Design a protein around this ligand. Structure first.
Ligand SMILES: Cc1[nH]c(C(=O)Nc2nc3c(OCc4cccc(C(=O)O)c4)cc(C(=O)O)cc3s2)c(Cl)c1Cl
Ligand SMILES: [Mg+2]
Length: 204
């Protein structure tokens, strides 16, 4: 019900879907959840990549989204946060009234024709794929790791986002400079695989 409401009324969640506002807000919601993981004391570096196909990935080195089975939903906690709008505690399905805290990545998932989630946690890499917010398989172990963190790569839905479908480096760079200044403990990298441009923001 939650993701359906987002697909139907994306304007209410992410902003204008025609003038590039919503499209960049998609990146901002993912980055905000990485910044929350830095605020909480776990994440020290965030890497934002504009891929050659105008998907965007956000990598953090925090705890990794929990992978254990959710006691209520009976699927991975990661799948619950990705697919149950109310679970993150930021958004709900109200079509009348539009806040500050909680995980909002389910809105990005809903409005992405594809999303890739990779979690490094408890010595294992875990991967799940979604299309239009629908998981294509359960969260699966792909390998071993000595690191922790979360990677979200999303392909904005070309059924939702019209006219402006390509990311503007400068729009993302400005928000990451602001976030780097305010979150002086975090290193933020921006990489554009379309033209090779890269930046590193870290409070000096
Ligand atoms: C790029 C990116 N990174 C992350 C991310 O690392 N997030 C994480 N959230 C948690 C977590 O809380 C999940 C939750 C659920 C409901 C409301 C909240 C809240 O903050 O209000 C929070 C718990 C634990 C634990 O117990 O080890 C670890 C993690 S890592 C996300 Cl998401 C996106 Cl996107
Ligand atoms: Mg409701």
């Amino acid at each position: 019900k939650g993701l359906d409401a987002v697909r139907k009324r994306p304007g209410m969640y992410i902003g204008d879907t025609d003038d590039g506002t919503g499209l960049h807000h998609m990146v901002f919601e993912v980055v905000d959840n990485a910044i929350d993981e830095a605020l909480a004391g776990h994440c020290k570096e965030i890497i934002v990549t504009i891929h050659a196909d105008n998907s965007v990935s956000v990598q953090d080195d925090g705890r990794g989204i929990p992978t254990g089975i959710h006691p209520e939903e009976g699927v991975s906690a990661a799948e619950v946060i990705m697919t149950v709008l109310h679970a993150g505690g930021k958004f709900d399905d109200n079509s009348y009234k539009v806040g500050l805290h909680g995980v909002g990545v389910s809105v990005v998932n809903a409005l992405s024709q594809k999303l890739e989630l990779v979690i490094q946690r408890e010595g294992k890499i875990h991967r799940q794929i979604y299309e239009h917010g629908v998981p294509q398989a359960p969260l699966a172990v792909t390998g071993e790791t000595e690191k922790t963190g979360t990677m979200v790569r999303f392909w904005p839905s070309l059924e939702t986002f019209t006219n402006v479908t390509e990311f503007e480096y400068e729009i993302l760079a400005k928000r990451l400079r602001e976030l780097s200044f305010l979150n002086s403990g975090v290193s933020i990298r921006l990489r554009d695989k379309r033209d090779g441009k890269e930046d590193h923001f870290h409070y000096e």
